[model samples]
Target: GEELFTGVVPILVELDGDVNGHKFSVRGEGEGDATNGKLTLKFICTTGKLPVPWPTLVTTLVLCFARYPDHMKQHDFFKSAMPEGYVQERTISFKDDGYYKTRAEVKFEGDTLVNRIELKGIDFKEDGNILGHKLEYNLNSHNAYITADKQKNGIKSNFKIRHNVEDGSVQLADHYQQNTPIGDGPVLLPDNHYLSTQNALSKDPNEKRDHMVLLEFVTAAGI
Candidate 1:
């Protein structure tokens, strides 16, 4: 059976509470239903600390998921949604002055699904400081990898994210290295940072946890 979602799609969200219980929701606005069409995303968060901007990776990911119900199929990956070596270009804007204007190219070779994201402008930054990010996922293996890097003035920051679909666990390895005229050629920042999380998807939609909400707004809607 084919499921078509049109107009506004409501995605319930609950994130880590600012001080107590905090939750929010978003409506994904688009033309075509659950199957195909581009979605313009927006968010409203109960926790004021969270940014209201639509995230790049997650937003795209959700779109793919919405379009393809068998996104992670063991045999037929991306089945009816994206064609082989398909490339999609779209602009994702933020509340004020940030946006990820980028191109996403998706490829399926054998059993691996490779998605590459090259950003032309992020947070309104030009194409000098940082390059962009790339994501690779093995549907059969249930493994996902993501990497992003940025450099400016004399400092560079890079991070890698690994996720296991089976256990819904994710890990991040981030590094901040520096080099400048004052001294040193290149050095890793003191006390590097690392992050890991378990149970990325829970059964309860209202369960409060560090979370993200993605929405597609109608063209007439303003952020």
Candidate 2:
């Protein structure tokens, strides 16, 4: 069943960590954009990771950084790389073991209500970047919806990060949601809209890999 979505606002987070009693900090930024009856979001975060022990680290890292064909490429084969177009979603998981994984996804929602963000995995381990790197015992997920007021186009939403570790167990964290502004961009998607497979590592400091979570919002098809 649906969680019953509502409201419009912005959700921002300041992340911090501790290792063996040491501490550090990271930042997360997410915002909503609504225009021409369409709602969208963009996000970037550091200070988190997928908690577990595995050797697939290289494979996971490969997927997160794997390159794909381009949507803007003049050839149809390469264009196939970007089927859903490209909407980048980035998430970082902070681990206590000096290793954390980051993820980037490409997704899109049509003029209708349906929207999806397919996570492209990106992983990393902080070897010498920061000190006091701790594990994220707080496993949580934050959820919220949007219902704008008089304006037909405007962001009304929030950014949510669920902490997975609570009471020494993995549990849901306080969900977050909000509605805000629809930033500047083309009303209609470009011919080479979001190239999912193509421009994999096209951005600066981009991580590609499996997404630890999936986020949704109000649109035509329903989140």
Candidate 3:
């Protein structure tokens, strides 16, 4: 997911700012055009089984998927940011006694390069029509891929989230800009989701400002 530079980070003077979730939507202009851009970068999510070369570590958390953004507005930022789109086009498998299982791939194109996302071991939608019979977190691993088209891949990301216990409104996890370029930056959920990054989008409406950051560093004697 990619969005045009709306903030002001001095370090990334050329960056297009950061996005809020796995799916980002801009005017879709060629990154050069702000008014009539026709290119859209979407970070999609899907499900499937886990494949080879996994470490035999205790399953901390069954990851549905993951991705990182490395490319800056002028250069790829994956290296400095660890923005690995490895989740793009990958599979997920259960390692016995697992509750949920799935596999998938994620990617991006146009003015931006999308990283990765997954839906391993879980129902895609709230309705769960695609999975077994209902929208329940199943441990059975499946095969899938992440696509922006929605229709082609039988998967999607940034959908509506609803919780009965929380007593909140069902909201859509649409693409939004926060303060990161890798699209893995902070996110602003309707009910306020506290992720490991603590980079959650500012919830206090009054705290909102056209977010911007500035970075300034001088080389030491030209190194």
In terms of TM-score, the best-performing candidate is: 1
**Of candidates 3 and 1, the better by TM-score:** 1
Q: TM-scores of the models, in the given order?
A: 0.27, 0.22, 0.20
lDDT of 2 by residue, 1-223 (tens): 0101122223232323333333333333333332111122222234344223111111111011112223322212111222233222223333322323222222223321222222222233344222212324222222223233224222222233333232343312121211112333212221221111111111233544312221322222111
Clashes of each: 9, 57, 46
Model 1 scores a C-alpha lDDT of 0.29
Model 2, position 196, has a per-residue lDDT of: 18
| Cα lDDT listed for each candidate | 0.29, 0.25, 0.20
Which residue pairs in candidate 1 collide? 4-34, 5-33, 5-34, 16-209, 28-216, 29-216, 40-216, 40-217, 41-215
The TM-score of predicted model 1 comes to 0.27
Provide the lDDT at 19 for model 2.
Answer: 35
Which is superior by lDDT, 1 or 3?
A: 1
Q: How do all the candidates rank in terms of lDDT, highest first?
A: 1, 2, 3
Clashes of 1: 9
